[PDB]
Design goal:
Strand content of chain B: under 5%
Radius of gyration of chain C: 17 Å
Chains: A alpha+beta, B mainly alpha, C mainly alpha, D mainly alpha, E alpha+beta, H mainly alpha
Number of strands of chain B: 0
Helix content of chain C: 55-70%
Subcellular location (chain B): Cytoplasm, Cytoskeleton
Bound molecules: adenosine-5'-diphosphate
Family (chain B): Belongs to the tropomyosin family.
Distance between the termini of chain C: 59 Å
Organism (chain B): Sus scrofa (Pig)
Number of strands of chain C: 0
Subunit structure (chain B): Homodimer. Heterodimer of an alpha (TPM1, TPM3 or TPM4) and a beta (TPM2) chain.
Structural class of chain C: mainly alpha
Oligomer: part of a larger assembly
Shape of chain C: elongated
Number of helices of chain C: 6
Distance between the termini of chain B: 70 Å
Largest sheet of chain C: none
Shape of chain B: rod-shaped
Strand content of chain C: under 5%
Number of helices of chain B: 1
Structural class of chain B: mainly alpha
Protein name (chain B): Tropomyosin alpha-4 chain
Order of helices and strands of chain C: HHHHHH
Chain lengths: 98, 48, 130, 49, 374, 374, 187, 276
Amino acid sequence: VIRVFIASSSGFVAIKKKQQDVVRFLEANKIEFEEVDITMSEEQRQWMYKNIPPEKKPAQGNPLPPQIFNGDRYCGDYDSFFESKESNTVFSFLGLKS
Amino acid sequence: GITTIEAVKRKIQVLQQQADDAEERAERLQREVEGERRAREQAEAEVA
Amino acid sequence: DNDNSSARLFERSRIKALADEREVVQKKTFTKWVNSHLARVSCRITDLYKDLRDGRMLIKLLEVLSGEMLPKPTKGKMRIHCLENVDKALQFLKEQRVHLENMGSHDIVDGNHRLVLGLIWTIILRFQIQ
Amino acid sequence: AGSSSLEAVRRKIRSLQEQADAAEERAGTLQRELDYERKLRETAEADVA
Amino acid sequence: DDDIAALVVDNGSGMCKAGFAGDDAPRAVFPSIVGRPRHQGVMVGMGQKDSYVGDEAQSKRGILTLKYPIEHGIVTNWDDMEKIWHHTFYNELRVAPEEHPVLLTEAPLNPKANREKMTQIMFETFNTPAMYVAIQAVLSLYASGRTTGIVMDSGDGVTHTVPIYEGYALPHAILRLDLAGRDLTDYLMKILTERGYSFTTTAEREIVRDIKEKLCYVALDFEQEMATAASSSSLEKSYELPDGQVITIGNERFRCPEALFQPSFLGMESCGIHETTFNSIMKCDVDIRKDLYANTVLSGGTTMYPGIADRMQKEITALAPSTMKIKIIAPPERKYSVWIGGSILASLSTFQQMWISKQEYDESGPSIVHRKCF
Amino acid sequence: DDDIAALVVDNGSGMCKAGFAGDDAPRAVFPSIVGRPRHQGVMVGMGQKDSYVGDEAQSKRGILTLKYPIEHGIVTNWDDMEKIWHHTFYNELRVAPEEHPVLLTEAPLNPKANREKMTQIMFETFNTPAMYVAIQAVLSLYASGRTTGIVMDSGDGVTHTVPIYEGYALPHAILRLDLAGRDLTDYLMKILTERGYSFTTTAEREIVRDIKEKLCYVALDFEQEMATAASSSSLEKSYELPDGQVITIGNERFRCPEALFQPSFLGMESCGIHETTFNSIMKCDVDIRKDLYANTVLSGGTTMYPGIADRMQKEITALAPSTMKIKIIAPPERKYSVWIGGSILASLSTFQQMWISKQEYDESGPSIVHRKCF
Amino acid sequence: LMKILTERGYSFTTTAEREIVRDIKEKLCYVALDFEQEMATAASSSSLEKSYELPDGQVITIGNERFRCPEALFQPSFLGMESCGIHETTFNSIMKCDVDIRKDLYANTVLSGGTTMYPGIADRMQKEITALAPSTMKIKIIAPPERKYSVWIGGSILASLSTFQQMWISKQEYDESGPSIVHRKCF
Amino acid sequence: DEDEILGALTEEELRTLENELDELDNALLPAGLRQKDQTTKAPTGPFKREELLDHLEKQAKEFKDREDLVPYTGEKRGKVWVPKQKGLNSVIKPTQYKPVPDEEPNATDVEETLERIKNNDPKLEEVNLNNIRNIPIPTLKAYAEALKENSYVKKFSIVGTRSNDPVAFALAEMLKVNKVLKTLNVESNFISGAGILRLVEALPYNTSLVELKIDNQSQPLGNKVEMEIVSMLEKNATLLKFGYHFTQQGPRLRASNAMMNNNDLVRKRRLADLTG
Ligand SMILES: Nc1ncnc2c1ncn2[C@@H]1O[C@H](COP(=O)(O)OP(=O)(O)O)[C@@H](O)[C@H]1O
Ligand SMILES: Nc1ncnc2c1ncn2[C@@H]1O[C@H](COP(=O)(O)OP(=O)(O)O)[C@@H](O)[C@H]1O
């Protein structure tokens, strides 16, 4: 099932816009999903930190909130989502068969 | 054309007509209420 | 409270009538003085309150009396253009060491009777014809 | 925003319309002021009598 | 005689406008889009001069990715914005930037580095002799011809309301809502998706924006429009795509702009635009609220929906006391009024002291803009 | 019946503190917030419960909207306040209110109906045997341990100064200024928008308040510290958001509480805290001013920024005549003083005369409080 | 009035709202003939309530505060002052005079100033002075309707007299004797 | 020379301006019908997306490349500023507060509860419908209609059900009929000002409801609406608790005074019963 890691309260507008963009895309196409708040629960955020492959980390600080998983297998961040959005390779990006 | 010239003309003195009529009405009411105020003051001094 | 009504009657009739006497007669007196100096240029005033409200003719007045070249009036039909035009004449009066207070561009543009009449009276009194 | 002359014509039309509109809105206030003053002078004359 | 005045450049979030000062209409109007080749190096580098700018960028929607240099009123990419300014100066206006001053606009509440970067780019790259930065909502009041009222400006990326009384502005009553045209476009795509028509890429973003511009209106009563649209198909309209394929919008026409008044549809914790205007009015003093009620001014492209003025009048009249009179002013030319304000501001003589000189700039650095502007 | 111990409830705008009388510290301290479900979400893991109260509401910030029942020291919403009282009595202390007397705290100058409504709610909803309403600043002077001095109280909702000389309070010199920590939180949001970080939601307001409580200090000299912050990078401090990002406050650390001493930053007409205290002293009689200068007492959470005592001593010494001496008394435990003096007041033997009995309420209605309590 | 209007919940703190409070005081205040009965009557019923309209369009209700604000003239202890009221001040000023001239001063009490225009000051003042004075002396309160401008009007009477043309301070006298001439020339 | 200015404008634009002045727009027309149609062709097909994408790509491929006069080299034509030259460091972390156990979701059948209300069941005492997925508003109207004749239910809550104005109208019709419902809860709904006004309009007709909670609506009530609630709340005397946050201060004061008077009447009748 699609799991989006989101932060309900953030100091940056772009993070909110990206999270709502992902939620809008998932809601528009009848896609099965579920959301987990990283600010509400500490253990889920800590699990999200070590779930990420080391090559896609920011060089500076913790990774950005919007992350997409299905089950326990990792799909990508917002940037890879946008690449798949324009390349029309979205269902392969999330892993659901079209 | 000539028809557009006449239409522009007609709109010009129509709008000028409402402007002039409204200004004339305002002027008439202004002077008339001034005279009315003078009459009211001269009437009230006698009660005083 | 009939005595309160009597005092309201007094301040409504007597004070306002005694003010309006002097206001009307002084405005009529000032109209002739401004039209005499404005007669040399092709200009004339029909109403003192309405005509001084663009500010161009006040600049004409100051230019005629001073006989010295004022800054060129800004062309424009907006309210702010009139404000800036009146501000030019007010600044010229200020730099000629003529004292004005409670005098603004928006006071002239809004057509306040007392301030317009006071401006004309101060121009009559303190400004030098020369 | 097709040309400056068009928008200037619009601005002149707006000025010509709003002059009449403001003058009518002032005339209404003048009329009610006149009615109030007439009522006052009628009451004053009755009190004189 | 001062090299035919300054150049007024209004850079909105969605579209850019530019023209000479003293002219009553902008000369150059074009969207702010930087389109790039997607992934392909097919057929001897098709997509030559990779940075595609403006109308010529929007012509090649099929083979390019369309990217906006300005997001939410803030410049994310500065090379793209430099490209936009260079294309404005040298390709359409075609005048020397070193011979004329430049006037620029900005939203009220922004990060402080934006003004410094604008000053640094305008002086170091284009070598302009003088420059100034102003606030868009003040220029809207300049264009409206008034000096007292509350001004609302809703662009493609930001909405903001400022009050001004007798030429004096109150900084504590300025409100900034992040509810604008792009959110409306995304909501229109979202509600169109479950109807049966799916739009994903930026080439469809332009089409959805065109559909919203041509066929959208603000409902006076929302539940009445629910009942009327459910009962009959009289409200339905037909849109024609660039290759036949005529589609029917229908119920969505008045559902997109309702997110302006109810942000719950967009899933954002924010108040309505009428509530924002009312709260900005109530934060002012007691004696000046009457003039602000009687001088409400609308501006921006987002306010170009039909039937928004009377709807906002009804909503404000509900909130306001019944004794006052509500006066919503919506000029038909309001979409350009911000730029028109610039054309008024540079024309005044008393504004000549407000220019930031280059000789003043190279003594103080980019920090002169804070003490010189606003 | 010495077993019957009164309950002391200090009731501020920000937090509520409750505990048994005669104790050193309040047993329960928690913010008075009533959180309610959002409209944008269709809720995650909430059952038949309608609202969340206090700490559990603070934990689930992401799915709720947070509301404060007490507004500027005035209870606008009485049902929410009743919920706060029920949570205090049944979830925090786990004691039946029908057995113990209740002591409450209340601002000096406020609507008359507030005391009557509090007495009404106590005697009818909770059916307490006895109750009493006390003023906060007198309790602060009780906790200080002296009977002579001027009490300055700054809470989350209101600031007020009262003078007391030898157990006699002067009602004509009491001053109430509406400048508290919540306005400072809103100003911190406004000046954090300047750097680039944006906080709009009430949960973001809680984040901003938590930033302010830890990273704000009052400068002894403002002009020195502005130049120091501009010159070097020594004043920056880093804070971690719940999402994971790191922000740097820097210059704003001494700019947020400076609005206490200069309200013109907020657009407010009124004067600063030191001017208010000086005016309250000069309203008094001539020969009691010497004792009032030497016994100035600080109170409230808002007065726990570092460096308030030195700044306020310097300001009053600048205002006061040079031949007199100024003493500022800031206990390290002052944040709970309004509670602690109350725990003293219920412990006195003669205070058993002051209890409002159930019978007296039954004959005299809710108007007994005006003749019974100051 | 601002302090007791805070008691009902309406807040006025700025200098601009002080003029609004002054207008409220001028329009909706009066002096009660008996203070305790008026308080009891105002507590019993709502017939004494009045409504005022704020400049922003909000509506407030004064009610009990109509007669409490002018009562501070007769009881300064409401304001924290320990001084006596205006009636006691007038009676004390009468008692400081000689015995022979007290009757004429009792019969010729004149009110003036804009503060003396609350509805019912004349009757209350007559009642209080009659209570203080002996029964044989009869009190006579004189208050012209246009008392607010009386200080001006007598001045217009004063400058038109023929004797007053010799009572000026000349420019030459001031130039000779400095600014200290006003103490010799004026009372 | 305005005539010369109009002559400088296009002659077709002159006809357009005359017709536009005659048109003065479409204020008489409703807002839906004011804006013009784009095309006249009827809708066709199910909108295959790939044809649109292929035609857009083809149109992008066959297009003139316009040649700009000035290419962008990114050169600098100005002077560089060159400014003049002359644990304690630990990062503070926020408070975690305390985790809260997850509440068990509401499991109450809608149809069974509605049937039990329709059957006038003695055992059913309290009805709770808070936080239920996608409740039908005809079903809510049926609940409001059916609970009129049920005298065995005392508490009713519809918090977080996305209720709208018709539900408020149905409840307004309810409150005149029923004499048993002690508590009503309509918080966190989408009821506008008119529905709240219609709800408080039913208060003078019944003397059995002692608690109302209308807080946390999606849109604010306004001045006129609150003016109506406070006046016809002063009409009613039975109501004991009213849950709302008033923006305006005068209505807030009057509502507080009225509710205080109601509870004072309750206290007075208790004292009168105690005396006998
Ligand atoms: N004719 C129109 N009808 C309806 N909406 C429009 C129209 N023109 C533009 N818009 C909306 O306004 C937006 C453009 O606003 P714009 O004025 O470019 O904002 P900015 O202030 O950033 O320049 C578009 O995204 C579109 O949603
Ligand atoms: N340690 C602290 N340092 C600085 N400010 C604080 C601190 N603790 C609390 N505050 C401020 O004081 C407010 C709480 O004050 P409080 O003592 O609860 O007042 P009251 O009890 O009268 O409501 C908070 O809003 C916060 O802004």
